[PDB]
Amino acid sequence: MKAMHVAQPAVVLASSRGIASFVCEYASPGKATEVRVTVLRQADSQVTEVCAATYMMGNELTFLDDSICTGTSSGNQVNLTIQGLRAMDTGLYICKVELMYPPPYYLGIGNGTQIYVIDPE
Amino acid sequence: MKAMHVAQPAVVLASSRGIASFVCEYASPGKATEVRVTVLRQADSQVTEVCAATYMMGNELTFLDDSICTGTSSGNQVNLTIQGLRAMDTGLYICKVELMYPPPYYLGIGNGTQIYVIDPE
């Protein structure tokens, strides 16, 4: 596991419809085979998992049935939406982003060593 | 698969005991979980596999039972020996080196977005 910075807006005001949107950006190396986003909520020191989705870099996010969250990946971004919010749902919403890549594999082929063996008697 | 250069001596003279030794160097990225060396022989255009061994970077090589080949890995090197050679065993001996690494995995944890939700009436 290598650490990765994730940036997101410090504060967001949910609309009167109770829809809140924010972006979580990160500095990835390249095209991750997998990318898994998880939103956690902190209030009263208690941390809960609000939602989780997995997808391939570029391909669209999709959360579990009737999720609070909607999502859209565009490059080194995930654009989260969270709906149905009410007053008591105020708190700190944290992005956890996992990127997974294929195992490196190197093949080297040498030019050859001509081995000469003596025929004695 | 990424290509990798492998260098080895152009010519080697087997001793009167029929023991021939050569080094196959390569430019690897780092500590490969796996490293697999394979020696191929070319004569009359025909290519045969003379021997194969697998090991971890640093840890010692060991070939199949009663192998022609003996081996020792030291950094970015494999030091091959080949014994029991006779005249007809003259030919081009090629190093094939495979390096395998673990799948990259990045975890990013955001600082959080404080979401404020309005209590209406």
Residue numbers in the entry:
A (entry chain D), B (entry chain D): 0 to 120
What does the paper say about this structure?
As expected, this construct was expressed as a monomer, and its crystal structure revealed the characteristic V-set IgSF fold. Although only one molecule of CTLA-4 is present in each crystallographic asymmetric unit, an unexpected swapping of the C-terminal β-strands between adjacent ecCTLA-4 molecules results in the formation of an artificial homodimer (compare the topology diagrams in Fig. 1b and c). The GG′ strands of one domain replace the GG′ strands of a neighbour, and vice versa, forming a compact dimeric unit. A structural comparison with the native, non-strand-swapped crystal structures of B7-complexed CTLA-43 and mammalian-expressed CTLA-4 (maCTLA-4; Yu et al., manuscript in preparation) which forms a quite different disulfide-linked dimer, revealed that cis–trans isomerisation of the prolines at positions 101 and 103 relieves peptide bond strain in ecCTLA-4 seemingly driving the strand swap of the C-terminal β-strands. As well as this reconfiguration, new van der Waals and hydrogenbonding interaction networks between the amino acids forming the (opened) hinging region appear to provide stabilisation energy for the strand-swapped ecCTLA-4 dimer, alongside the formation of the native-like β-strand interactions between the GG′ and F strands. The strand swap seen in our CTLA-4 structure is strikingly similar to that found for CD478 and also that seen for a llama antibody variable heavy chain, which was hypothesised to provide a basis for understanding aggregation by Ig domains. To investigate the possibility that the strand swapping we observe could underpin additional levels of aggregation, we incubated a concentrated solution of monomeric ecCTLA-4 at room temperature for 24 h, whereupon dimeric and larger oligomeric species formed. This indicates that purified monomeric ecCTLA-4 ectodomain can refold to a relatively stable strand-swapped dimer and also produce larger aggregates.
